[PDB]
Design a protein around this ligand. Structure first.
Ligand code: HEM
Ligand code: HEM
Ligand SMILES: COc1ccncc1CCCNCc1ccc2ccc(N)nc2c1
Ligand SMILES: COc1ccncc1CCCNCc1ccc2ccc(N)nc2c1
Ligand SMILES: C[C@H](O)[C@H](O)[C@H]1CNc2nc(N)[nH]c(=O)c2N1
Ligand SMILES: C[C@H](O)[C@H](O)[C@H]1CNc2nc(N)[nH]c(=O)c2N1
Ligand SMILES: [Zn+2]
Lengths: 408, 413
């Protein structure tokens, strides 16, 4: 059936047909919704998946059923026979990567989906090679502050025993350290990964914002450590435009968000190493990175410097401090001419994107739980936008952390 | 379905196990291939439909009072079954009605206030026959629930549906709301959410003061008859003028709100019986007023005005002038209620209490259905514990349900 979604503020109603294409499960059933749950080959499985993908690719370039299309299916089928897998054409690799992003229901940044620089790293064979490809990625994507969306794609999975993996969750992240008094220095999210780097020979500076080394695994071998050249790591000192004391908090962050632990699936093929990057929405840093209790957890300090009454929750001291921190982050990046988008601008763009997708594509899968910003929700247009969530392929998928699988 | 579903809290790493979802009775809207978790909404029962619905409820009632399989249980079952046979409906005992109403609340996945579910004053209005009588029952409800500012949660239950041509209905969406008036020039005076209903009231004979905060009259339908208008005694309507503890100018905005949120357009379903008029009330979470009522663009929409008074830079969105004024407004709301000693809860306290509630429900009940999209407050989401809490949503009965607006279905006499 055609499904409709209403915006309760504008009363705009869109009609979804695209969902009829999905075949992957969402996790919900007729009786239980799991919308807030974080996460709910063989030759024989391989061909239909390949065919599906080739089909939509030749459909997208308006040459469905053409001679190129027929030969490609023929070529692919044959290749799956003789090798138990197949290799994507470059055009297919790029199409697939862009579409994985386009289909990412949790991403509010998808208006940019077709502007993705795709780096083909499928000829890589070693961790040193991965490091080279990653440096080039970081240098290209950072672009002196004028950030550019990019993805680097390493060889696909074969037997599962020879995976390429970036062990880092992002290319650039800060270390976190367990202190004898039980507190945590730096980013608590990374304490485990940090310990692993230390154990593998990394010499930690033991500061609050130590850029972690890269830990890179090629062809199933043990991972190897590398230091990203610092001149490639763009960082922003956080200051406030009114509170001159804010710089005294000693806060900073990195300009390039570059998620490195996801799995890219295209036409049945699995790319276990596909670091991709765009640019930040301010709340990612200002709200989550800085203010989550399990992260840098800075609210109380900021509230102190702001001299707020912190004896009662109903003074909303937390909320006030939250806004000021997010003002600072936006201001700091903007002042340093580093690309960043505020949650108001981003959500507007997403709404416009949704309309585009409904018009040109018949829908847009979207995860309201993720799309709505972690502050000021209902004063952003997405809060009021009904969304339908469903899984389309190619896609980005989660995968286990490599240190729970790897044998040394 | 799997017997054990786990939910995780990503902040505390606490894992809970749900078994109560097995008792799910109705559809979510979701399927295995699509999730409708952000969709707002995703003639009478025959005898054979009614039988299993009633037994399900009666069993559940007698199980709750630890008399399952007892002589009184079996007898009650037999009496109900016989009553359905001879009349094609049945009447709930007072005990069952009370248990049912409390459980409809306990089961309301969208409600963050459910720690309170067992403290609910139930008013049995099933003897009501006229709209004047409905007015009497509603006044008594308002006065009891208001309690001079020390608010008490309550529900008043009017007669259940029979053939569908004799429904009792409160046409108001809440017992106390402010009128909205569309102007010839396209502007709106008062609350834009209430323009349609206000128009209906005026058509029915109501004379509008045409102010910004005019309490609407009650429009009350008994036994399927045309609805009738009544004015709530103003002394029964407790209100709070909004002021700010720092900004002396905030009072000059002339904002106020009423103390008692009392939703009156929902349907209560118990054991397959339908109570189409069942107004209930609790107390406010500050954000309901300060974020939604005041700052929704399609509501009072005051952000710009507050921002101007705050001398904020409003040329760029990235100044976060909106976020800044939004906090100040919510501070003002909480401060004004606490100052006038009218019960209210901030989103921090409410969400923390709900997490404790949910954990206790998981331990004593085997689950707690929760709608994350609704449970997470409309501001400062991630700095509340509910944002980090995985939830399972499903529909248990007894329950509160939406129903169509009465002016769309009413057969005018
Ligand atoms: C270009 C600017 C972009 C912006 C502003 C943006 C914004 C966001 C934000 C705020 C999230 C929520 C993540 C979180 O809260 O932790 C997200 C999720 C996501 N984004 Fe985007 N994004 C951008 C580009 C990209 C690109 C280039 C890709 C891949 C090619 C991508 C793929 C994804 C995926 C797969 C998720 C879901 C993450 C998960 O499930 O953990 N995004 N995006
Ligand atoms: C006692 C204090 C209470 C608090 C603080 C509270 C809080 C809330 C809030 C903030 C919402 C979201 C509503 C919205 O954003 O529009 C809600 C929804 C809801 N509440 Fe509660 N509530 C309380 C009492 C009650 C009572 C007494 C009942 C019924 C007996 C109830 C049943 C419901 C239902 C059925 C919804 C869903 C609303 C809808 O879908 O339109 N609540 N509650
Ligand atoms: C409940 O949430 C979690 C639980 C466990 N692990 C991780 C998570 C959140 C996962 C974080 N995903 C983080 C991400 C991914 C892609 C992005 C693309 C662009 C951008 N600016 N930011 C992104 C940020
Ligand atoms: C998408 O949202 C809508 C769209 C159309 N109509 C109505 C709505 C929202 C429905 C309003 N629900 C409003 C409500 C219900 C029960 C409550 C109980 C206690 C309390 N403090 N507040 C409540 C507030
Ligand atoms: C439990 C819940 O699903 C979890 O906290 C989600 C909620 N929504 C989110 N939304 C975004 N953008 N990022 C997140 O990490 C999360 N976390
Ligand atoms: C489209 C979306 O489902 C809709 O705006 C919902 C979102 N969550 C909500 N949550 C609460 N508490 N109240 C609401 O009215 C809504 N509206
Ligand atoms: Zn769902």
């Amino acid at each position: 059936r055609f499904l409709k979604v209403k915006n309760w503020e504008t009363e705009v109603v869109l009609t979804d047909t695209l969902h009829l294409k999905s075949t992957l499960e969402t996790g919900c059933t007729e009786y239980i919704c799991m919308g807030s749950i974080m996460h709910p080959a063989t030759k024989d499985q391989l061909f239909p998946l390949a065919k599906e993908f080739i089909d939509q690719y030749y459909s997208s370039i308006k040459r469905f059923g053409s001679k190129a299309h027929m030969e490609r299916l023929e070529e692919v089928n044959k290749e799956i026979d003789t090798t138990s897998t197949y290799q994507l054409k470059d055009t297919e690799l790029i199409y697939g990567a862009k579409h994985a992003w386009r289909n990412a229901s949790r991403c509010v940044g998808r208006i940019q989906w077709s502007k993705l620089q795709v780096f083909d790293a499928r000829d890589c064979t070693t961790a040193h090679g991965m490091f080279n490809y990653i440096c080039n990625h970081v240098k290209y994507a950072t672009n002196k502050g004028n950030l550019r969306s990019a993805i680097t794609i390493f060889p696909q999975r074969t037997d599962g025993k020879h995976d390429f993996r970036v062990w880092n969750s992002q290319l650039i992240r800060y270390a976190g350290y367990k202190q004898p008094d039980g507190s945590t220095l730096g980013d608590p999210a990374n304490v485990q990964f940090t310990e692993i780097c230390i154990q593998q020979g990394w010499k930690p500076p033991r500061g609050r914002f130590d850029v972690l080394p890269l830990l890179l695994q090629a062809n199933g071998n043990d991972p190897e450590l590398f230091q990203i050249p610092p001149e490639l790591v763009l960082e922003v000192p956080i200051r406030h435009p009114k509170f001159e004391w804010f710089k005294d908090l000693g806060l900073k962050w990195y300009g390039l968000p570059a998620v490195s632990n996801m799995l890219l699936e295209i036409g049945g093929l699995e790319f276990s190493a596909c670091p991709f990057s765009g640019w930040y929405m301010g709340t990612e840093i200002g709200v989550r990175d800085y203010c989550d209790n399990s992260r840098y957890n800075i609210l109380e300090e900021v509230a102190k410097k702001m001299n707020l009454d912190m004896r009662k929750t109903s003074s909303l001291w937390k909320d006030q401090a939250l806004v000021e921190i997010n003002i600072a982050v936006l201001y700091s990046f903007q002042s340093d001419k580093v690309t960043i988008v505020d949650h108001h601008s981003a959500t507007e763009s997403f709404i416009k994107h949704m309309e585009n997708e409904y018009r040109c594509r018949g829908g847009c899968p979207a995860d309201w739980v993720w799309i709505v910003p972690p502050m000021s929700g209902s004063i952003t247009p997405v809060f009021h936008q009904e969304m339908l969530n469903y899984r389309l392929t190619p896609s980005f998928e989660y995968q286990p952390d490599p240190w729970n699988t790897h044998v040394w």
